[PDB]
Structures are given as structure tokens and as C-alpha cells.
Amino acid sequence: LYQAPYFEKSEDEMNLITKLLTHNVLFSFLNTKDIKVVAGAMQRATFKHDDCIMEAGQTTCNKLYIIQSGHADIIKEGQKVYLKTEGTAVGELELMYDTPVVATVKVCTDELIAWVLDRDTYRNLVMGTAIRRRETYIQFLANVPFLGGLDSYEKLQLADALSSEEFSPGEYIIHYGEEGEWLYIIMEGTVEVIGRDADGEPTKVCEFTQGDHIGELEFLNNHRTVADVVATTHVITAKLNRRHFEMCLGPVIDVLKRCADDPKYEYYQNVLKTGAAQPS
Numbered sequence: 001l002y003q004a005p006y007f008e009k010s011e012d013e014m015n016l017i018t019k020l021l022t023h024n025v026l027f028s029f030l031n032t033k034d035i036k037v038v039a040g041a042m043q044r045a046t047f048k049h050d051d052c053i054m055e056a057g058q059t060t061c062n063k064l065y066i067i068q069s070g071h072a073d074i075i076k077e078g079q080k081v082y083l084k085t086e087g088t089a090v091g092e093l094e095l096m097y098d099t100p101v102v103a104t105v106k107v108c109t110d111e112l113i114a115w116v117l118d119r120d121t122y123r124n125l126v127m128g129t130a131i132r133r134r135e136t137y138i139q140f141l142a143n144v145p146f147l148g149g150l151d152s153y154e155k156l157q158l159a160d161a162l163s164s165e166e167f168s169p170g171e172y173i174i175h176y177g178e179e180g181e182w183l184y185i186i187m188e189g190t191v192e193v194i195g196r197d198a199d200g201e202p203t204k205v206c207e208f209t210q211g212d213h214i215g216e217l218e219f220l221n222n223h224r225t226v227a228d229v230v231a232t233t234h235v236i237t238a239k240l241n242r243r244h245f246e247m248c249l250g251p252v253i254d255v256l257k258r259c260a261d262d263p264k265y266e267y268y269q270n271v272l273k274t275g276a277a278q279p280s
């Protein structure tokens with residue numbers, strides 16, 4: 001029965017805002033209508049350098065801010081600890097765990113333009129099962145090797161955008177020569193990567209299993225997929241959409257780019273030097 005506030009926006013505002021939402025993991029699993037209601041309930045909020053959007057200990061905030069342009073530091077006990085850039089959010093932690101502001105947010109650029117959501121609209125139309133989704137993945141993600149370089153906060157950020165994807169033996173996870181919109185982290189089962197050799201014929205490259213990742217090549221290097229990935233067993237994966245890849249795997253991209261060196265990626269090395277793929 002909840003009806004949200006509405007503040008009319010120009011056609012470019014709704015467009016701009018809707019884009020920030022579909023790339024911020026707080027809103028990953030909202031349908032199209034609820035994405036728009038949310039964009040109408042947002043409000044502009046501009047800040048200047050050294051301005052504080054919130055302060056450690058504050059109880060008077062209770063708002064979620066999505067950054068449009070500009071940066072802002074996270075300061076916990078006098079120490080800067082995190083830089084918040086465009087597309088990111090401050091305030092979600094207080095809204096999800098109902099506690100006073102834990103850290104101070106200090107604009108470190110000449111201006112900061114935010115879009116601000118009220119607690120009532122977030123808890124009723126966004127949050128959903130956020131805490132349970134976090135319970136589903138964090139212990140797993142904490143044990144996934146290539147995620148070593150995310151801190152607890154970043155793993156939770158990733159868990160907020162994850163959903164569970166199962167595959168039947170022999171079903172395609174990824175098809176050769178397609179755009180590809182998901183990275184997969186195997187939780188259970190085994191997969192085979194089926195490339196194409198010089199005459200264009202199927203060739204098996206390797207297998208992958210629990211804790212391995214597939215999908216990232218095309219996101220690192222902006223080409224269509226260069227292999228099939230097929231389940232050899234019943235497979236369970238957690239999956240991350242392409243629009244969330246950079247916002248969430250940012251601090252580990254460089255582990256991913258060791259695809260240039262690892263010999264399991266020798267197939268792909270040879271594909272890259274002969275230029276055998278198109279952008280997507």
C-alpha cells in the first residue's frame with residue numbers, strides 16, 4: 001500500500017538518475033516500475049569542498065545518498081579510510097543495520113552533487129532481503145581466492161549484487177561469439193571451456209570448478225566471447241551482472257588481468273595476438 005513521495009524531474013534527470021541506480025548494487029534486484037518510483041522520490045543535494053554529508057555519531061541523518069559527480073572521503077576515528085566516487089552511495093550502512101552514522105563523509109572535490117532518498121522509501125521499496133542475501137554469500141566470498149583483495153566492505157558490496165544460478169549437466173553457461181552479460185563464480189560443480197581453433201572448430205581448453213571465475217575476459221578487453229562455457233555437472237554459481245562488474249570487482253581487476261600470464265589462458269593469449277574477436 002506504500003505510496004512514495006514524488007518530485008517531478010526533467011526527462012534527462014530521470015534518465016541520469018535511472019542510470020546511477022542500475023549501476024549501484026543497492027538497487028540490483030528491483031523491477032522497472034520500482035526503479036522509476038525510486039527515481040521520482042530522489043531529490044537533488046549539492047555540497048561544497050570540505051562539507052560533511054554526515055558525521056560519525058550522528059543520529060539525525062537517516063538518508064541514503066547516491067553520488068552523481070564528485071568525490072568524498074570516509075573517515076573513521078580521524079583517519080581517512082575510503083574514497084567514494086561517482087555512482088557510489090553513503091548512508092546505506094545506517095539504513096540497513098539501524099545504527100548511528102559509523103563514519104564521517106567529507107567532500108574532497110570542489111562540488112559534490114548527490115541524489116538523496118528518504119529512509120521510508122528505501123526500507124519499503126528497496127532493501128528487500130538485503131541482509132539474507134549478504135548471509136547467503138559472504139562466507140563463501142571470503143573464501144574465494146581471486147576476491148582476496150576486497151575488504152569486508154567490498155565483499156558485502158559484491159554480495160548485494162549476487163544471485164544464484166544453477167546449470168544442468170551439458171547446459172551452456174556461455175555461448176561462443178555472444179556479448180555476454182554475466183561473470184560467474186562457481187560454488188558447486190565443474191565446467192568446460194570450449195574454444196575455437198584456427199579452422200574454426202571446437203577445441204576443449206580446460207575445466208573449471210569451485211572458486212573459479214568465468215565471464216571476465218570480455219569485460220576486461222571489450223570483445224565478444226571467444227569460448228563456450230558448458231556445465232559438465234549440475235552447477236551452482238553466484239552471478240554478477242556486467243553493469244556491476246567495475247563498481248564491485250574494481251580492486252581485483254588486476255588479479256583478473258593475470259589472464260595475460262597464466263598458461264590456462266594460453267588459448268586466449270593466442271586468440272588475442274591474432275585479433276580473433278569483436279567488441280560488445
Ligand SMILES: Nc1nc2c(ncn2[C@@H]2O[C@H](CO)[C@@H](O)[C@H]2O)c(=O)[nH]1
Nearest residue numbers: 082089090091092093101102103153
Ligand atoms: N568503503 C567503506 N565505506 C564505509 C565504511 N563505513 C562506512 N562507510 C560509508 O560511510 C557511510 C557512513 O558511515 C556509510 O553509509 C557507508 O557508505 C567502511 O568501512 N568502508
Ligand SMILES: Nc1nc2c(ncn2[C@@H]2O[C@H](CO)[C@@H](O)[C@H]2O)c(=O)[nH]1
Nearest residue numbers: 214215216217226227264265267268
Ligand atoms: N581457463 C581459460 N578460460 C577461458 C579462456 N578463454 C576463454 N575462457 C573463458 O571463457 C569465457 C568466454 O570467452 C571467458 O570469459 C573465460 O571465462 C582460456 O584461454 N583459458
